[model samples]
Target chain A: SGFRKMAFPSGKVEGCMVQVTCGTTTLNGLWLDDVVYCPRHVICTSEDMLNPNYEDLLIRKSNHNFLVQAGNVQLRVIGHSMQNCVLKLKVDTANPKTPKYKFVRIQPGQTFSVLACYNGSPSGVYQCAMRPNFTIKGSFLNGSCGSVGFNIDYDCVSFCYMHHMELPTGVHAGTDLEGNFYGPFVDRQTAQAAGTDTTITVNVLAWLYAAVINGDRWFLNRFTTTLNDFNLVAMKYNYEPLTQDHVDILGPLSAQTGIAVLDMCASLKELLQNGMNGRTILGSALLEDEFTPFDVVRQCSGVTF
Target chain B: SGFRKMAFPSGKVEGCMVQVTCGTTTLNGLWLDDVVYCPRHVICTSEDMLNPNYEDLLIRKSNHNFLVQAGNVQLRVIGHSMQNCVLKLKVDTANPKTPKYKFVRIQPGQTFSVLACYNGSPSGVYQCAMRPNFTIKGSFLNGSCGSVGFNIDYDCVSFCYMHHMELPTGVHAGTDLEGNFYGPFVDRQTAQAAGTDTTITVNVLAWLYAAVINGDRWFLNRFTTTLNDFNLVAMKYNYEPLTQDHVDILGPLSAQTGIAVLDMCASLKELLQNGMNGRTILGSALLEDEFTPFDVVRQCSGVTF
Candidate 1:
């Protein structure tokens, strides 16, 4: 009974869910009785309307061709029947000429995972909307097999936490609050500074996303190394864009881990890109005929979410 | 006078050294007298000549523009004086249009390492002759600094042996003569078959070469993990192109390790390339969002020679 009314249009709206964002608080829900109530949060303009037609595509029972945008999850397309369908991914929806991924054939009971990233921006920054678009084509549904449909599941970050050791939420690399130095970086500032790379991060994110989406246990195990790095002794909880409100949402541990992982990813990438340039990681040399960039990548893959 | 005579065209020849290959034997020396003879083997046609003009370029006192081919060594160019020269690499001499590497500036007291591989052949098999060409230009020597010259050193393979554990010669992947199985492959044939890859091998070779040429200790240490894999138990002595005579030259251990590493590189590459496609390495899954291709690459970079 304490549910508040929708703030816009005199609360007369119905049958539509709007994601409400007011400052740092966000609430997602459908309208009922011409009003929407969010506990512990003020209602602002409900600009982001969740499309009902689009939501239906996520259900496995929808036996028709469909296109849907993925969230920050490892996307998998499960085939319902033998004459299932083929899948094509549009990474950059903005560019009509953007090359679509090679078409993947999905047979009955088979699952196809989306492994590549859909980063169309030049800055290569991670964004939820930059996630790829999946097109299930029933046009090729001209086979002897029965009807075809797909079921989707799994959030990448959540899966990693579930399977791998709980995400190293409060893990920090470089100098911590106690002035203890961790990692090869000279200081925490230096480590954090290195966290902004384009190519390596892009590739790493793609790699990690693919691993989770494919549900590969061994590959996931490799990231355990990264997780182990995060659990190192000197790590301390740290946060960026620091605010108690932000910490309340992401949790202090995850917030710190996120920053640490960002720094670690940049550091690892630097170690790889410059290893051939005579740079060291953790006071060790990564030189020719010895270690390779991939070794660095493998050893440090866990730092990613 | 146990110094054998130069064989071809009688014993009257002088001022040249011809690499003589007879059946399974190869010898190199100056042509003091014409009758080219080996200590034990007979000399066949001397087709490959060690260019005397090029040899002079290797010396530090040349003091002018020069070019020379590298021979499996982690090539380094030590600058002489401040007014020193700039270096340009020609990976494929056959392709005049082959894009040269970005020009590198070699200041005095500074050393420049060659980190890329020059395997231009379509098959991507390793060849010493396919090694890169180094051109030192005087055109850019118009600096205000003093005179400039360069000194080169260190063979990549030899350097690894010197710095790390001795090369694991005789190591086998898959099944060996004793019928013991190693690696994820069902048999040695499967592992060996994987060794014949193009793109991954090319990239791995380049990565390893860059590490060696750059003398990165940390990178090299990562390879120690690979070396450890090479020395694993189920491994047994194995050889391709089986020949007792060939074993005498390459040594049984190096030969076996060579085949094993070849297979490992291929396996590693496949792990990376197909990791996104849901493949495993050493019974481990390389899946999306869990592991990346680079992780596979980093873990297996040691299999390179």
Candidate 2:
């Protein structure tokens, strides 16, 4: 048998809504929280003040990156500022500068202070953007290490990271990764086709197959936890799952990805026949520990950390 | 088919900029970064130079939160001191001893579990821990469910599916239905980058509504057939996909808590889907008594303890 090894939060969350109460009626759209403000600008969905485009909605970071129909708009602009401090709300507008758009004397610690601009009906999406009302000076923040002349506050920082956009952070052990899925088909089909009786591992392989690839957490957790006890995955979603149906269906995905069906079977069968209880391993939690599922996954899948 | 069971990162590192320097002068405003302070201290505004008044900002943690204005102020506040720290970031909005505003000095680390402090122009939003910062040793690090934070498990991963349903257990029976579906799910854009397929939301009911998928022949068969009928979620499965009609059927019968949820499910082929026998004993391979995963079923019947 080909003695081998291996190993997939591989989804996205989108299209949800948040309800914001502007005044009388609550407009339900994407509510912006934990977001920076563009505070004195407009992005166009075709809205304006001169002609008050009341249909736009939005938010963007850095600073005021909006396409106010490019044509223009006129109105009030409140810059994010500290109360009791001098305040000036200016707009980098394409329209006339009369009033420079809503300049107000600032308030201290206001979400409304972090520069936000939105014009919409009480029932529609309120296009808005903003930034906190401060500055993050230097790469050596957290107050420590360096600063110009100020006696720096702590100079030590938290909530920090550079997040080089394209950098790879590497992957952790995942279930049913693309490779894991391909592994069994290649090996089992070939081994069986060549005359080895492969039914025993086929179904188990299928069970694990679904485990790794799909981000089906609950099933994965419970099933793998059960496997930690060295129990077989006798059923799936309430149906008798099958990975050993036939060779054709198994096809030839066997480019020999790291995980080997034989190896997994070997490891599992050993735990079944020779371990402390001859079913599960010593440290396996029967759901006693929260991360217990991973135990079954490594043991049964024959993959180690 | 009848109704049955179901189951069920970020790297931003940007924003944090608020140029209060609208022009010649810079207005002082608090800056928000990774902190959770007063989320509900609405500031009162006085448009003129005289009698300018500001309301109070607030927070006391089960442990942690942040707030920030922009420009004239810049500093970071980290409130996660061990669990014994007495955190007091009081700006004396009306303190009998201190000057009612602006801010200064942390009371120093209280040691092993006490709250450490900081000097930053923070805002008024109190909170539990956040993605960028967790483990608040404050008043409530071990709490679960609702605004105080969600009902999370000991592992720190949110195994929320544990409450979705109560299944019948036989000696040869049931197990926990558990795993992911909590934590501030990464913003969709970030989740997409990781290849996640679904996103957990606070609407949770919408998420849980998806739990009671058909566990009968059709649903289980296709599910058992294709990795979980998961592809059915994508539609185009060889068999019919569970869709609007299915919801129309099970919708009312499913647990509609109308709040939040988890996603994962069970299968029945091995359970003999259509029969009175609803479970398949997932036993130890050697048929051993010690390692049986199903042994708990009889012990865990209709559980709630």
Candidate 3:
């Protein structure tokens, strides 16, 4: 079937707001103009600030770049400086992809940049031409000497295209790199004409469209989270052998909370469907392993070395 | 206690994002690096485009001037061809204020442009200072032969101060010609340092530091909104309404399936808060709104008028 082209109104269409939610972590970003993160690092909140402790793990090899290896195809680098870093992928182990792009070198207290280059074909499942075989990691360095690799990924090149194409018909996605999706036409006339029939079932598409129209109500019902609730349940708690006091407090809470541990013994149910979790702790054993003084801890030490 | 100026180890704070909140609705319009919006009608949603109405609320007497009036104002003019229509204001009714300036003018089908005179004052609360007891109204005419007026009230004179200033500390109330209260702040730091608690704050100070910061935030927030949300919303809706059935289905589902709502809202919010909303909508809207008649009726009708 020939799809009819759509026409938008004149003047300009204002950008929509965006929120990034990954597990317990939720980050808010905005889409303006044609640039996604164009005026980067504007809307990040206090929590979004990288903790100094993670600095070593976010080691940068050269200006604008850093590198880390994934144990099982996943490496997560947490640091204050990684907020605006672009994720790139490269496959070669011996030679650099671009001769002009040299390996980033780092010095003491200096900033360096690196790109994560992935080499593979598109999986067609998600945007950014899902490359499975290769994954490069890096951090942003801005100090006395700042230089990092400038390797652009052909996959990331069409980031906006991939995001926009993800939306079904009668719907649109903001051009921002963050992929802000809007719309599910409600009016019957408009909805019927622009409605998506294939790929997404009519029932699913209808529900999706309705969600877009009355988002405020849905936000209150589903999205709203209190600080107290978030802190209590959605955090990692690492404590030694439970002390008397710990048992008294936590034991009661656990019982009252009715915690249910699901055992997927029958089927091979993957804990994380998104594949490997690429996160690791880097740098000195003491800094990365031991909990030292809150103030003097060398967080970015890993990146520097 | 002396305020310690703690510098970062890297001589720069990492991951510090700026935050801007909305305040009272400012009467003044937004002016970009080049283009401007005079009584600018930004598209809040695609539904605005259905009728596509353009009401020329106010006009300048010449290439650089605005008409004035008292009480509520409304101006509507219809013509086959209309070019640059400037809006100016007369500072003093009996004796006009020195350094008279034209604020803004509406161009035909393009973004509004601010006159050189009013470029200084940015988006904020403003009042029309014009001839006494004079009211302004609009007149419809064909071609370039339209009616002109000496309505100074329509010519509101206001500008944003860019530089920072240190004014004496205190609370004071001022009044506009409309008998509206205008509050001006006094700086306590200046008063304490000077060792003189003066009753009246110093006039004509270098610049109000607090005011400048506030203004900067205001401008940035507005810029984010105009470039992001407004544009994207228009593009998404394209002048369509939500249906009862769709709303019924998605509304409950989104509420029950909270994760989906959070994801969608966050994505949309980020797109608009960032500046990419304009670029994305412009690229698609231009093509979609022009060619796709069905999509246009569904998404582009609401805010176009």
Candidate 4:
């Protein structure tokens, strides 16, 4: 026979039965030596086959802690042991000198949900980190054997998303995609919050481009009642850069919805710094009282992206 | 007198009907020359009905507060009856150090609503005058009496509204009329909070114009996934004013999203300023992230709104 394949015992084999050689190395000891077998039967090193270290393991797809605006927040966590883990969420407002953190524990699964309520104070980076605990040696090891960490940078964006649907009722006085301004809702949070006899403050932000380009400022000018012409001059005049003072002035309107103005001012400043032209900036200064049709024009504007 | 207006009864009479002199100087130790009827039968004078010693009738509609950064917030009542009512809510980090007020009580007919929430440090004007509690009491009285106050400063605008609906699984992203990109709402709260978020962040102002102009640039460029190559480039290249530190190192990689270059520099700066932007003018430096597709050619040619 020109070449015969080597046959080894089922579990063990004598060293003399095989010869193996790789690259330029000449084996002095018995080695598994078959040219074809060398490529297929070569054992991988420990580093290649052994389990990965905790840090090296890709357990969590993404980790982030975000400072979202005050509102209801829904969170989702994905991972293999996510079902066995718990999500703790907290809103910290302790120690005026430092930002606060609040923690809430969530159910286990591929996904977990929560509604984070934010009051407008001690606002700082709202951070969230996952701690997966397992029973081992009668103790718990977090983020080691089965743990992960994630943080999302906080901002008003989260707040906006959480409370987008809960705006006070009569607040939406403008027309729906159409030019006809609909009357206030029969009931709304603002209305409820204001009780039956109180006046609720309504802040409106309209796009000015409609009037400038389309010559149809109905949305803008229509903020006035059918009996009164909206004071377009006053509305147009107040549109200006939001100063740092503005944030200070309007920061805390409510623990829930009032402070959004501060967030808006901050966002606006961000836009301005990003080389956004003034024309692109359109929003309203805070207004208190019954919403008039004219108020729509006072609040919003249009600009190129 | 030819068919003069009939006068059934004149001044006070003790026993039988008696006609008093038209110019009578005194009646029952008081002057009653133009007496119309008995004191019990006539309406009381406005002055007599006014109560001057009624504890000033103070009632607050809202409370104001300020948030500095991240931390636990505990409100201590400094004035009278602080512990009688305590409200706790979470504020987003985006609104850190901003002033926010919440309505304490709002009645149906009140002119002004009281507000309370946190404001940033070095606070601005605290216009307690705008939310005078007496006004709230007056509104209650008016509502009870079925009278409308014409001269009141505030009337309910009905701002907050809540609606429930099923949303698509993908993220919800769009631009306000201001050309700013907003959102990626994966849930309902996010969608609802969008309105409040847009209004507070001044996005509503931009949306108004975009709505009027019916232009899709703001919607498409910053909000949607339809951006053109050039628009994307411009957006990436635009220097975010609040992100000056980021601009220093990542200036070259500003426009590139996928490739990993010096983007870490931008991210670092963003992380640093995450929750601080809402407090001061400098806070606007925070970066805003959302999905949008650009139309480079159309945008370059000057889109309408």
Candidate 5:
């Protein structure tokens, strides 16, 4: 029998909400995009600002080709003095004045920092692209000494969007609101075939299929965690829970598609709420024979199709 | 500003459900306890059984004192022959014939194996105690030798139980089923005083405080994941969600208390389901002034004290 294995503390999955205070909210949308398009200069002096777990996050050696995620990145330097410690960065951006690689002079007690992002704009589906995977010349990175290495903290929401854009059929797994577990299905047909044993209506199956194909191992885990989240708030909202029959039909679907189902359901739900005749990115390619109770997804409101 | 950070892909949080096909279920309960209490013989020869990420899971040095979890553990050894490759296990089970951690010579072409558990009975809250953190004598364990080093694969369920028992107050973080985030709260009082802007009714505050006190870093992460899980199931269940007023009242509570509130609510819910006049281990020490809504928990089924 095939087995599924998962490790803990994958990458940090953060939302776009940078800060929110009561009525006000600071979303990491335009501002973040701007930051990515134009990198920010970061100054790190106090060791307190240093990420203690840098070793766990960064590559083993310094002066080696390292990819930094599009977000806040910091690297430390240690040597006899500012003169002994050298800093260098290579950016692929097309600029005549900017050298192919520039040597940066270090200030006393300051660390090198960069706020990065993907190469392009956050249009269709944002992604954690290596805008330009660069390298740093420092010591002690490989355990010998002028500068410490750094790990990229790409924006998680962008990564999620990237996953959404490119669907894959990975071994997905998720349970319905009930504890009944489901899938690892090869595709939507396998799940729909499971039929009554699972909830087959969630369009998320499309995404889960995409995830496996993409090798986004982290997506399924995050989806599973999020899918089950409904359990926490269900009872409080006077919400209607699935009957055993509903769960029975949904389980196989959830197992196969995982978070994709919820995403589809939620998307359709939101779309329907706005008005009728709204098109959805989800279920666009879904075939009639691919779904169970016939015409439309069961979780969404109205539009019996 | 002080910052709190988290990484993904922590440890795998698996339940005791070894196998469950509908009504029938195989929990890692007494059977597991017995397996742990007594060692089981395992035969491993196929390469399929080898965990590929062993390097990530195992310690760097062989012949080193390594701590293993209390469940399924597997180690591979590579050498010239089963003769050249020797296998020995030193279990601290008190017995005269056992010798002072004596080595049991391993079988040929077979990988050494052991089914281990903690050093005690499963009476009070169970824990992932190392029956005896042991070592294996195998070639190439440290690098070049006769056997490869082994890591202890202890049980996660047991670890959770141990955490519950200890109840340390750590920097716990969990949002209620709502998107509103909470926590990194130090203790109960700080949460309560934040009051109306937050929902202070949750007893989870107590546990969050305990978690911070305990430094059980993993607990907070798991709790956050589980607490967030409720959102997925909420809409489907016709569950009632808190209104803005409710949220405004609940935010501070969640911000400070986290999963402890839900645990308390769920426990009370289950207890109330069984009957009235029941005592709860959770919130036992909770002062009347600690929770909002005065006398009882809101998420619970029905109880007016």
Candidate 6:
């Protein structure tokens, strides 16, 4: 709806961000060029069109396993695991490096929402189709939302995302129209999870927008306030080829949106290559507290809002 | 249309609110009198221009029913419940009591959309409104967005609010957003009731700046994670009003404004004692939060990013 892309066209580079057309003499920015994300998926199986066997790993709106974390919702594996397996979570299984958590022990079946070995709902929504290393024993699965070029299924994990509100169990915050509860909901592990977020979710988005883009406060504050979603966005500054459509209206569209910043657009060229569904990507960037607001504005002088 | 009131005025004491201001911790701050607000009209329901009999009670949007409670929307009954009863959803109303919502227990004969209610389109557009008790026999309607200083007709429930994502219906937050969800959905009563909440509804509002004045934490979280709304303000330590005129390219004007922090000039001889316009009071004192990586310095606490 806003910007377009199947995947980011450029290579990774360190980066910085700004809100729509902004700042006040700002400050020194960062050389940030490379950004990467993923609650990450541990695909239990590979995607196979002939077998059409990938849905087994996806988190269904019906029996999904996500919970509201302190400030975000999360994906958790509620059941027990049988055999022992590699805890490939967050760790760069393929790269043999990296890391991620909050709760649940890594006991056989008792730990984690998505298992490296278990199959089905608790399994990572990610499959062999999206990223590399779901299983070295299996091959990679590839696809996008509207990716027909590669003949990948639209249901591929790349098109999946965790929403702030749990769909099926709508109650509590469900109390009013703002819906369900006050939120810090988080979505996990799929490459394509651009679902609709509301006042609650967007409100947090605004705080981080101001904190990150305006360089408004302590770097550490902005650090924690921002969403942890990989390659995420609240509202974009509308710079053209990337500007998406306004979903809520008969009313005015605000400056906030879901179209994420630069590097976030990479990796999923196929999903976005066509266009954004109303659902757009969400993400958070990790930064150092050492940088002050002024430093960012002064430094990233040429950075686009 | 829950909490009752006039508008807020000025003068602060041990105000529980935190909006970047001053204080006098020396004494017990409570004569702390002063408050103001508007977007008002006290309509005595003489439906006819000839008779004006309704302003018994009404609060300005700046100080009314915004508090949260369960239930999707609101409900306000209209017309004579006896021989002739038609729901005339106000494009605007007064009395500012009782309240509003969507759907109808609509009798076997009460179907069509804006049928019985010819006063305005069935549009759930935001408009100034008023409320009072819904039933128990007493019919005198009155209200307005910008009260005519005289009157407004009641019978409206604007469909407003943000929602998680579309619930089962998959329309808008459709089911809840539109009250009267065709089927499964629940509503509770609290009349002889006092609704209390600063989250959920306010949370979304936080997504906007109004959420600030409408104001929370996750406070500590937003303290670090929450938005400061109003041009990105967060308990800014009231440095005395240079922080006025909220704008950022563009955003909607929410009634829960932050102008309340300072003395906004208030004087109330009583409703229309002088006129149905202007404020009646304003003034206050402030303090600081214990945790401040930034504020630990600077007198006027002239801390900067």
What's the TM-score of every candidate structure? 0.17, 0.20, 0.16, 0.16, 0.20, 0.17
- What does the lDDT read for residue A4 in candidate 3? 8
Model 2 lDDT tens row, B67-103: 3323244333344221111112222122121111221
**Candidate 1 structure quality by residue, lDDT tens digits, B266-289:** 343333433324222211121111
lDDT of each: 0.20, 0.19, 0.19, 0.19, 0.21, 0.17
Tell me the TM-score of model 6.
0.17
Count backbone overlaps in model 4.
156
Worst 10 residues of 6 chain A by lDDT: A13-22
Model 2 has fnat of: 0.00
* Residue A108 of model 4, lDDT score: 12
Best by lDDT: 5
lDDT per residue for candidate 4 within A1-305, as digits (tens), equals 00001010101111111222222221111111111011100122234323323223323223222121221332222211111111111222211222121222221110111111112211001111111110001011110111111111121111100111112321111111111112222112233221222111122211122112212222222111210112222223332233344334333322223224433333323332343332322222212122211222222222211
> What is the per-residue lDDT of model 3 for residues B165-263, given as tens digits with 9 covering 90 to 100?
122221111122121212232211223222322110011000111112112111112222332333345345332222233224233323332323223
List fnat, each candidate: 0.00, 0.00, 0.00, 0.00, 0.06, 0.00
Candidate 3 lDDT (Cα, whole model)? 0.19
Model 3 spans with C-alpha error above 4 angstroms: A1-215, A219-232, A236-305, B1-37, B40-305
Worst 10 residues of 4 chain A by lDDT: A1-10
lDDT tens per residue, model 5, A1-305: 00011011111222111110111111121112211111010112124224322223223323222222223422122211111111122323222221112122221111121111112111010111110011111100010111111111221111211010001211112111111222322211122222212122222233334333323333233322234444343333333332344445445445554544454334423333342232212212221112222112211111100
Q: Is candidate 2 or candidate 4 better by TM-score?
A: 2
Could you tell me how far off, in angstroms, the CA of residue B285 lies in candidate 1 after the best superposition? 35
Q: DockQ of candidate 6?
A: 0.01
Indicate the docking level reached by candidate 3: incorrect
Question: Cα deviation of B16 in candidate 4 (Å)?
Answer: 64
TM-score of 2: 0.20
Query: What is the Å distance of residue B20 in model 4 from its true position?
Result: 52
Q: Residue B304 in candidate 3 has what lDDT?
A: 18
Q: Model 4: DockQ against the native?
A: 0.01
Poorest stretch of ten by lDDT in candidate 1 chain B:
B158-167
